[PDB]
Structure formats: structure tokens, C-alpha cells
Amino acid sequence: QRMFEIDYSRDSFLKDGQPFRYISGSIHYSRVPRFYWKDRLLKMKMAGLNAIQTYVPWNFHEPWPGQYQFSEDHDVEYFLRLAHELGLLVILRPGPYICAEWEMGGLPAWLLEKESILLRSSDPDYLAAVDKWLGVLLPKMKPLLYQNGGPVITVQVENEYGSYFACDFDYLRFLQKRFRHHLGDDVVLFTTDGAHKTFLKCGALQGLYTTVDFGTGSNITDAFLSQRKCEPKGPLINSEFYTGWLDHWGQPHSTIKTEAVASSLYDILARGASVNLYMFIGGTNFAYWNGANSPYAAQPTSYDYDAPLSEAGDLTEKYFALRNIIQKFEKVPEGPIPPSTPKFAYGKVTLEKLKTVGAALDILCPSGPIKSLYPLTFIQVKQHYGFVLYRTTLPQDCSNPAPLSSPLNGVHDRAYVAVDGIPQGVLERNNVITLNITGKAGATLDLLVENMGRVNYGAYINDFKGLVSNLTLSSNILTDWTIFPLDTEDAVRSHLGGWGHRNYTLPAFYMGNFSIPSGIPDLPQDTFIQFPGWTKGQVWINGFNLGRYWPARGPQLTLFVPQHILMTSAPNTITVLELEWAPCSSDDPELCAVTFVDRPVIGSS
Amino acid sequence: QRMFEIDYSRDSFLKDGQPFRYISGSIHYSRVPRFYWKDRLLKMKMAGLNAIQTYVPWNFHEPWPGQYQFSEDHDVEYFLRLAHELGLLVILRPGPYICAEWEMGGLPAWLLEKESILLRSSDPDYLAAVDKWLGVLLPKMKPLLYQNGGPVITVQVENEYGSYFACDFDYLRFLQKRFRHHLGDDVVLFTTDGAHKTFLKCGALQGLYTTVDFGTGSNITDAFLSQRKCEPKGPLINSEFYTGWLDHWGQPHSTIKTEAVASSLYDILARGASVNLYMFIGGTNFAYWNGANSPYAAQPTSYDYDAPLSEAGDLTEKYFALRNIIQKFEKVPEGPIPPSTPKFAYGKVTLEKLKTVGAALDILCPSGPIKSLYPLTFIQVKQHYGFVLYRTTLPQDCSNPAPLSSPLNGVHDRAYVAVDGIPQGVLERNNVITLNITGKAGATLDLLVENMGRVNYGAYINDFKGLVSNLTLSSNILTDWTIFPLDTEDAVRSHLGGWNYTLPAFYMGNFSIPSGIPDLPQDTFIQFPGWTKGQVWINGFNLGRYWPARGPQLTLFVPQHILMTSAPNTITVLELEWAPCSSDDPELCAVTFVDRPVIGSS
């Protein structure tokens, strides 16, 4: 019965023999808690979208080889079902590289266990891991195909491959053959690339339909002409029409005018083009999922994106303006729209210092350290995300300050340095490769190294992390390393072992509790946590990793806190890992505190 | 162990041997859905109140003699246990008469089966009814007394008896004796009356502590001197310090300024007096629970009262201002206050005509009518609330207008008249005692009569309802009546068995709310643009009466717990006067859900 195909004769899609054009919005299920999937999807449907687009991040689902996550917030099958049940069609973008301001572009870090791997190429090791991943992911997607009764109408192969240097056409042909093998010969397979022959040159492949992406800054005619070069026949498609843009820590929050998006959307729609709004809701990079760009600049925790639906799912002016545009072309669903969620200001919650990272080494690294003559990377010590502590002793007296240095700029990405429990300051990828330290010969030198996000775009996505090259002290290479991978996630969930197992300050864990009453229909509510007086770190509430805060740089001050991780009667435990400076010294305990507010601050003065 | 008592030395209470002063607010559990009891009580606690005060409406718990409701929303025991759990003490006002802008001041309508009953007196049948009720209620209250480890610290006997004409002291003494028999000798019993010798005369009794009530317009020194004249020693107590005032359909919405409440509150607290804010939350008169005053004027569905918490439980400017006054005397609890609930505008919902009242008599009256030579009252035909259809046939032809009148003003309280299914207009208690009708001889004359709420204050509380005296057509007494009591509640629940003016009719429609949305359903307000007068149910729950034609209330409060996501929600409207549904345009036959209340329209 069920068919979805390209009508080449008629520059169109056919959906069960009928002319079809899609109006889609990007939503990433990995950036929205499952609790709220239905809420966002319904808001998307009510805007008049007939389809949604999503990425499948490979590393989100296979964080260790052969160890899969497809349940709860990782249940892509369920997400796709929910979309179908709401009558939305799905454009699937399964990678295996997705870019997406997401850690390493979705690629698993354990691929880097072969140091010389050439990612996104016919490197046989890269291919064997890709093939094994597709043999798991694609048969799950097969019954979700439009023709087998599900919502999936088109599937993207790779992501803007033409923007990458390797230009390996055997890789692309390999992906095509495997996608076909698992999904069959009917499913529409496409590529997406920047709208210019120079990008199309290496990204397009015969047998995969060529689509382009472009934003409100682009000349629409020119963009679609570049697509028409590779596809003289078939529908016009903008796979990523930018509703906003990404951010970086320390840069002003990106915004795009409502009128600019509305007018461009109108013109695209007026050409009979199919179009996807990237992003429709952006959401959040929880835990360590954010990516980065080269030269090294990490994206922050919020992926608000200035999208039509805000980070927390709110209806914005942009949302209504885009809905109004769509209404000019198609009948939008009737009835009231699910609302922006209520937000609640829980107020100030005092914390207190529990333990330094040094003191918690036993619980953080319960299998003990790896010893090495020279430093090893995160990947070599089997750590992908978070922090690794590197330890050695001073091989000479440093009563006078001696330069600690990474001559090849190999601190990836930030190191918090202490000598005998005295913090010495910070080393920084690019910015500061030398730090003066003092202390006695034989003193314990500690470097707490944070992976701030693997680069997700450009040539340097093989971003190893850790001390990736030697450190010197007064110019001599430092040797004899004791290296502790830190299981911060487990440790925080056991309250650093406390619950069993059923200027600068030292990096440390600060904890505090707050209660919310039960039997109140409208509590808990969503909230935003803010860190007045803190500097940089990670935050958990009830062991859920909300992401990184960095009020010292901005633009993001608050972090989003979804209500479903909050409990009533039972105390809610906040854990803060502060890396640089905590406001918790003086008499005043009231300074050692966070505050929950009812409005986000993601773009301050 | 636990003790609560009046100390006449320090002119205060002693709670466990220590000086105690209560700062209380009124909340009536019968006017707030149980779903929201903890929310309202916690907001009260967060205001700095150390106590709540409530009435027990007898008729809410004993709708027929020997038939009791103490479950779910009628669960007074649970409500008091809940106040206790949250650290609130309770001042209990069990009546038997409570006044309270509540149907018949809480007295059950079945008392009026004795037509000559003198309510609120030593009338032996009245006493015997009361005594049986106290024998069911007060043993439930005994374990909830402070001395037995519950929250109840004082108990009011009767309610402003000094404002009633009877002045029957044997009645008050009987109550005191029965309360003592069921509750024991330690419980602090008290009375409440207007703060003037003329009100205290018949209201005060020896052995019952005398308290006064008064609002923001009163001289506080004088108000307390009149109490002191009755109780030279003991706590000063304002049992009802008005934060607002009641409403009447067709009168402007009552408001009292925050600055006036805060100012008087501070003044009363500063004197060391115990005080109860009436109302702290007013809530809603759902179904037919509203009262009325004489000369006949019904209170509306909303009991918002201009209280510190709004009808729907919202934190108002008045709320924060009184909290700040309480803070000057007492540390209030720490932490954030529960929020005003989110409100959602579900929008416009179209309804269709189901059946006129005329066509649904099988379903409304499955027992068949009662035949009578002259008209019978609601009570005589065994109905208390709602609507009764009175039917006769025209004796002479009426081609020319003929006066249809109740020469003794005996339509209690409003009648919707049709002749052979042609609406004629409306007869109204105290207002329109004559209406002209036409029709042919032998025509069917129908009067749908509404009990608009039994008077709850003054001498005329024995308010029977129905056609209480004869009707005349062209001066001739109309006789031979066929009288149908109407089971509106059942019929509405059954979707009427099918699981200028217009004829009284039921209109129904439906709306869906999506499931798996964390923040729906939400509270809302229903509005009836184009409609005139009627009753509304949602999912068979009777939300009350609407009357946008008179105001000041236009919207009715709809609590979210009655709304579902698994199946469509049904709205049923019974429109009594004129429905916007004739129209070629079915879109006009519709109600609207909005996210803000309109209870003070001009």
C-alpha cells in the first residue's frame, strides 16, 4: 500500500501516489528529556509542521564498543513512534557523523584507540566500526520506514561530507550500500551540503539525492541553482534553514530576527521547496555532550539556538510568526496550543564543601591509577568524557617559581594545577601554555584535566584530550606519571560513597539539599539554576548531570532544570563540582549558595 | 498531657501552660475541592497563620435524614487531620446553623417537612433533629480535639444567635449541654456576635466564652469594649475580621482595600487579641450551595470574597500585605510559597441542543408526576435543590393576553413560563408577580420553577421554595396540577438517557485535552457569551449557576482535576431564558474557556 518516492518528472515527492511537500522542524531527542518529547512534538505539530527532522548521535547510543543504550532518554525507537502517533512524518539523519555542535560530531571517542585513524574515510578500521553500528541501528529503523508502516520518509547519508577534507568517495559508496542492505531499495536516501559547487563537489554521490542547506543570509535563487546543478529533476530541498545559530563560551549569544526567518521561510515555501527548520527546538547539551570548533572554542550547555521554541520549550514570538507564515500555504491544526511550562523560583539554596577531588580519589577511581613514564591521553586511560587527574612529584626544589609548561600546546583542554594541595592556577589550550609553580622537591604535582568537548567540525575532529604531549618543568620533561580516570558520574550518584553501593580554590564537591512539598498539584515546576560568585564547573541535581556552568565567561548564566528530576518530601541533592574558585571561604555561609530563578539568562549584557 | 484553656489572669489562652494567641484565617472545606485542600492550607501556613477556622455545613453532610456523606470532598475529618499535619491548629464552627452565605445557613431543607418548625429555637422537633446530628458529628470531632492530640482548640456554639429574633436561651443551653456531653468539660466553647450590646443580648450565654466579630469600618476600641462588657477577663477575640464582603447577583462586586485590612489587622494584633480573618480563601459555591438574603437576593456562584487568596487560590497583593503584617509579630515559615496555579484558555467549544426540559421528563422524572388540586412546595414533593416543573391546562381560551399572577408573591424564586411550548417570559420573587399569557383553552401551561438558594440570615430562613401560594389566571385560581420533581443531576450524568425567550433546554458539547503533557490539564474559567441564565456541568460535575445577564460574575471557576485527557470532556448547559443557538450560525451556540476570571463586571 504505502509508498514514498521522488517524482523526477514532476520535481516532487509522491506520498502514496499523491504530490507531497514537507515542512519540517529539527528536534534532537538527545537534547530534550523524554519526559517532554510529547510536549515539544505536539507544539511542533500545532505550528503546522507536517514532519520533523532528527540526528541519531552514535556516541549517545554506543559510549563503549558493543555496549548499547536504547532505553529511557536514549529510546530513539520510542521517539519515532511518538512522532508517528502525533501524525508527524520523520526525516532521519543517522550519520554516522552528524556535526551538530555535539561531542565529536556524534562519533564515539573509542574510535581514537587507533591513534592514526582517519575519521569519515575508507580507513578499514573506521569502516568496520561504522558497519557494526549500522548493523545494530538500521534494522531497528527498518519497521519505522514509511513503507513498513512508520513515519520515516527520507534518510540522510553522512552530513555535509563535502565540507570535509578527505573527499573519500569509497566511504560514501560504502555507506550507501550498507544503508540499502539494511533498509531496502525504496527508501529515499539523500545528502546535505552547503549551497555552492565547492561544497557539492565532494558531498554529492550518484544514487543519493542532493539537497542543500542555507540560512536567512543567503540568496535563495543562488542556493537552489547550486542544488539544481546536481539534481536537474526532483524536489527543491533546504535540509537546514537556520532559525538561529550556535554559541560559544565567551561570545555574545547568537540571535536571528523573527522577520528575517519569516520572510525567508515564505520565499522558500513559495518556490514549492520542501524545507526543514534547523533548529525548531534546540534544547540542552546535558552532561558533557557539547561540541567545539577549531581553533578551539567550546559550545556551551544551552542549545537554545534562538529557536522558535525556546530551550525549555516555550512558545516565542518567533514561533507564532512562523506558524502564521505556514498557514498561508497549508491548513494548520485547530485547537489551543500546549502552553509554555510554568517556571518556579525555588530561591537560594546554601551548599557546603564536602570533599576536594584529591580527597575523593578513592571513590572516583576505585580500580586505582595507571602508571606511565610519559603522560597518556583520555582515550589511552579508557576515559571519554569529563576529567582525568594526572599526578607526579617535583624533581627539584621550586622555592623560586619554576615554569610548568606544555611546549607543544598539548593541554586538551584545561588543567587545574595544584602542588601539595596548594592551587597554582590554570593551563589552557591555546591561551596559556606556561604556569609558574612553587613547592619543595618531591612535592605532589596534580593536574586535573577537563575535556571541554571534542571538536565536531573541520579537519581536527580526531581531538584526543588530556595531556596529549609532554609537560616540562624549568624546560626538562617531567616523567613518572600516576594517572586517575575519574568516574565522577558514579561517585556523585553515591554521594562520594556516603550512600554506599546498593585567586583559586582546590577543585571540590559542594553539596546542599532543598525540599519541595508533596500534595501540591503544581509542584515541582521547571526552574533555572544560577551560580552567583562561582566560577567554573559541573552541576548535578539528584545525580542528574545538568551540564557545565561558566558565569565567568557567559553568555549563559543560568542552566535549565526540568521538573521531572525533582522530588517532593525527599530532599533534592545539589552537587556542584567547582574547578577554579568557590565563594565558600569566609564566615558567611550564605555566600556558599546557588539560586533558582524563574527566567533564563542565556544572553546577558 | 495536652492542654488548651482560657487564662483569666493574663487575659489569654494557655496552650500547654504557656501564653498563646491565635492568628487564624477562614477556609471552608465545602467550597474548595479536596484536590486543592493541601495547596490552600499550605499557602495559609506560609502567610504566618498559626490556625484555621471552618464551618461544618450540616446539609452538606446529611442531605436526607440518616443518610451521611463524610467521604472524598465531604471528608471533614481528613481535612482537619490535614490541617494538623501541616502544623495548623483548628477553630471549629459546627453550627448547627452557620449562616455563611450558604444554602439555608447550613440547615437541611428536610427540617421543613414540619411546615410550622421554628428553626434555631427549642422547638422540640428541631432539637431532636439537631441532637441526632450532634450524635453523629461530635463523636467524630472528639478525637480531633487538642486535648486528645488533634488540632481543635476551640469550638463555636451556634452562629450570631443575637442577630436572630427568637432569643431562646433554652436552645443555647441545650447546645452547651450536648456539646459538653459529646466533647467533655475541657474543650473551650465560645459564641460569636456583632460587637454591640444589642447583638450580644440574645447571643451570649454563661458557660460559653463571648467573642465578637467586626470588619475594617468599625472602631476597634469600641468593638472590644462591648466584648469586655460580657467577658471582663480572658482573651480579646475577633472571630470574623472581614477581609472582604459577600456579593449578590445584580449588585456590584464587593471589595475591601488592602491598606484597610492590613491597618486594622496590625491594630488588633498589637492589642494581643486573637483574630480570625474571614475569609482567608473564599472559594466557590458549586452546584446549588449558595445562600440568599431578605428581601430576596441570592449570592452568586463565586465566593471569591475579595479574600487574600482568590477564588482559584491565587496569591494576591492582599495576601502578601497581610503576611508582612503578621511578620511584625511572628516569624513566618521559611522557603518559597506554593504558586498561584497555571490557568489555560481552552478557547471556544461549540454545543448542540440535546433536549428541552419538556422533552426530557421521562428521564428527569422516572417516577412520574405528583397530582395535586393546588400547588405543592419543593419540600412537599421531596426535592431540595434545583428545579421543579409545575404543569396545568388552561381553563378558558386566551387569544387576548391574560394576566398570570401570584397575588401573594408566591413564586419561590423564579419561574420560566411556556404555554403549549411557546415561551411566555418569567415570574420573579419580589419583582414580577404578573405576566401576560396567551394560548388556546386546554393548552398546556408549564412553569419551570428554580430554587435560587434558601435565605441564610434573618427571620425568613424557613424558606420553602416552589409555588408556595396559588396562581391566578384572569383573577381565577388555577387548579389541577401535575408536578414533576426533576432529577437534573442524574439526567445530566446520563447525557439525558442517551448515553424574546427560548424553552429551557440542555445543550451539550465536548473537547479533548492531550495526554502525556506534564502541565495539562490546567485550571480554567468558563464564560457564556450570548447566553442568559442557567446551570453548567463539566463531566457531570455541577460547577454552579451562570447569569451574565445580571452580573457581576461572568466567568465560573473550573478546577483541573475534573478534566480528563483519556476521553473527551463533556460540557452540559441548562439554559433557562435565551440560548444563542437558533441562529443559522452554529458557531454562536458556544461557550469559551479563558485564563482570567471576570467576577467584578459592571
Ligand SMILES: CCCCCCCCN[C@@H]1C=C(CO)[C@H](O)[C@H](O)[C@H]1O
Ligand atoms: C565557529 C564556526 C562555526 C562552524 C559552523 C558549523 C558547520 C555548519 N554546518 C551545519 C550547521 C550547523 C550549525 O548549527 C550544525 O552544526 C549542523 O549539524 C551542520 O550540518
Ligand SMILES: CCCCCCCCN[C@@H]1C=C(CO)[C@H](O)[C@H](O)[C@H]1O
Ligand atoms: C443583604 C446583606 C446582609 C448581610 C448580613 C451579613 C450577616 C452577618 N453575619 C456574619 C458575617 C458574614 C458575612 O460574610 C457571614 O455570613 C458569617 O457567616 C456571619 O457569621
Ligand SMILES: *[C@@H]1O[C@H](CO)[C@@H](O)[C@H](O)[C@H]1NC(C)=O
Ligand atoms: C539573488 O541572486 C539572484 C541571481 O541569481 C538575483 O537575481 C537576485 O536579484 C539576488 N537578490 C538580491 C540581489 O538580493
Ligand SMILES: *[C@@H]1O[C@H](CO)[C@@H](O)[C@H](O)[C@H]1NC(C)=O
Ligand atoms: C613566570 O615567572 C618568570 C620569572 O621567572 C617570569 O619571567 C614569567 O613571566 C612568568 N611566567 C608566567 C607564565 O607567569
Ligand SMILES: *[C@@H]1O[C@H](CO)[C@@H](O)[C@H](O)[C@H]1NC(C)=O
Ligand atoms: C615525551 O618525551 C619523549 C622524549 O622526547 C618522547 O619520546 C615522547 O614521545 C613524548 N611523549 C609525548 C606524549 O609527548
Ligand SMILES: *[C@@H]1O[C@H](CO)[C@@H](O)[C@H](O)[C@H]1NC(C)=O
Ligand atoms: C542531604 O540529603 C541527603 C539524603 O537524605 C543526605 O544523605 C544528606 O546527609 C543531607 N544533608 C542535609 C543537610 O540535609
Ligand SMILES: *[C@@H]1O[C@H](CO)[C@@H](O)[C@H](O)[C@H]1NC(C)=O
Ligand atoms: C474609637 O473610639 C474611641 C472612644 O471609645 C476614640 O477615642 C478613638 O479615637 C476612636 N478611634 C478611632 C480610630 O476612631
Ligand SMILES: *[C@@H]1O[C@H](CO)[C@@H](O)[C@H](O)[C@H]1NC(C)=O
Ligand atoms: C398585560 O396586558 C394588558 C392589556 O394589554 C395590560 O393592560 C397590562 O398592563 C399588561 N400587564 C403586564 C404585567 O404586562
Ligand SMILES: *[C@@H]1O[C@H](CO)[C@@H](O)[C@H](O)[C@H]1NC(C)=O
Ligand atoms: C389555594 O387556594 C385554595 C382555595 O382558596 C386554598 O384552599 C389553598 O389554601 C390555597 N393554596 C395555596 C397553596 O395557596
Ligand SMILES: *[C@@H]1O[C@H](CO)[C@@H](O)[C@H](O)[C@H]1NC(C)=O
Ligand atoms: C464531540 O466533538 C466534536 C468537536 O466539537 C463535535 O462536533 C461533536 O458534536 C461532539 N460529540 C458529541 C457532543 O456527542
Ligand SMILES: [Cl-]
Ligand atoms: Cl536535524
Ligand SMILES: [Cl-]
Ligand atoms: Cl469560618
